[PDB]
A = this chain, B = another copy of it.
Amino acid sequence: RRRQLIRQLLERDKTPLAILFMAAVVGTLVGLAAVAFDKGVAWLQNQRMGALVHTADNYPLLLTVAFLCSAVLAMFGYFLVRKYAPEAGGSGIPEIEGALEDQRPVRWWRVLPVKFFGGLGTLGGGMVLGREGPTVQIGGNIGRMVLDIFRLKGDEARHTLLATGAAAGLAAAFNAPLAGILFIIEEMRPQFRYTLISIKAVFIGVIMSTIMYRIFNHEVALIDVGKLSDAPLNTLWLYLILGIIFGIFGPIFNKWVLGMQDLLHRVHGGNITKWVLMGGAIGGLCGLLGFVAPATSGGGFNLIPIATAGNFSMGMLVFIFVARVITTLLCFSSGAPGGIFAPMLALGTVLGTAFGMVAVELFPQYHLEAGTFAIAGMGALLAASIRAPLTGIILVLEMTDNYQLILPMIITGLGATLLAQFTGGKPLYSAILARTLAKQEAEQ
């Protein structure tokens, strides 16, 4: 195929000017979309607190309004999804992935208004769920919307404007431009065949999206953890132990969400009334736990710098980790709209911290900061549950800016991906799409 190759080489990277200008406009929208989505999730969580104060004397009443405020806002989001766009429950990354395999439809006239307001209901109640779930899905559909609107043709701009939407979709949820671009390339793109995703466009999408997010969010960082110690060569072997620890736990977690989807599906059987009622109960718990023990609830971004600074006991770190596994499963297996990405950062941090602590006290010739081991294990559950290790590495890099730790961070992950492969683990996203395509053909 020599002459075929020579001609194609001479013709590489000539994305059509129309596609690059549309990545610019998909980006900008996905940005404003996510910025608005974040600003919203905040204003609700605030009004939630302000009610606990109008009622701060009657401590039983206190726990009452904490439960019902979140139960109400949860049910709203549960209802809005199956009363409207169903494929908008849970993460939505499985679907946008599917939509790049051409197996799942981008119902943007429905998903746009169901994910965004349904998300605001679950997230804005303080459920254990990330912004990236909605923003990624919403961003893709926004890419589709501008596709159907401007009627562009070809597989290049369909898959491209689909990608740069969900890329800009994930940039804007972590102010992590590089992690967005990479998410497409490692995890999101169609994994069994070649593709026409114009990467240069995905960038213009990510750029414009991140610039919008900087416009509304600068001078404060999502996670400030400051500069921690370095890692001596003789220490690396402890991070390659940590990966193994995550490599065997990553898949065990995958099984639960699946088995928990099932075990929670048997609660409502499909009935929109039992299901919504159930979601209000979950959300109410999360609003209560958010008052009575905030580490077991919410998005987890708040307790990450606390865990790193060695400011949590081992007793606590275990407690936090048990409960936040419990409330993560209740929140994402039940299918409430929102990602199980950003809570998977926390669970890993709360683990690396626990290991750093035992690693500090067993080897003082090493002179350990327990916080290096949380930063390794932040993107560790990502490598061993969803098996996109290169993206959790550049994500963690971008949020925390401790580049020195590059080796134990890439060493731990390889540890986690490889033991997860070797202990029969399936990538959490694609394990969901299959159960979804097997359900879209197991009724005939």
Binding site for B on A (CB under 8 A): 1-3, 5-6, 8-10, 12-15, 17, 20, 101-103, 177-178, 181, 185-186, 191-194, 199-200, 203-204, 206-207, 210-211, 214-215, 218, 233, 236, 387, 389-390, 393-394, 397-398, 401, 403, 406-407, 410-411, 414, 417-418, 421-422, 426-427, 430-431, 433-434, 437-438, 440-441
A348 to chain B, nearest CB (A): 18
Q: Assembly of this chain: how many copies?
A: 2
Determine whether the beta carbon of B9 is less than 8 Å from that of A433.
yes
Residues of B within 8 A of A193 (CB): 194
Cα separation A200 to B390 with both chains bound (whole Å): 9
A194 to chain B, nearest CB (A): 4
A7 to chain B, nearest CB (A): 9
Chain A interface, DSSP helix/strand/loop, else mixed: helix
Determine whether the beta carbon of B10 is less than 8 Å from that of A407.
no
Determine whether the beta carbon of B406 is less than 8 Å from that of A403.
no
Determine whether the beta carbon of A417 is less than 8 Å from that of B200.
yes
Residues of B within 8 A of A10 (CB): 426, 430-431, 434
Residues of B within 8 A of A15 (CB): 421
Tell which of B12, B398, B440 touches A2, judged by Cβ atoms closer than 8 Å.
B440
A35 to chain B, nearest CB (A): 14
Please list the 6 inter-chain residue pairs (A to B) with the smallest Cβ-Cβ separation, ordered nearest first. A9-B430, A194-B194, A9-B434, A8-B192, A6-B437, A401-B403
Determine whether the beta carbon of A407 is less than 8 Å from that of B203.
no
A184 to chain B, nearest CB (A): 11
Tell which of B3, B211, B426 touches A441, judged by Cβ atoms closer than 8 Å.
B3
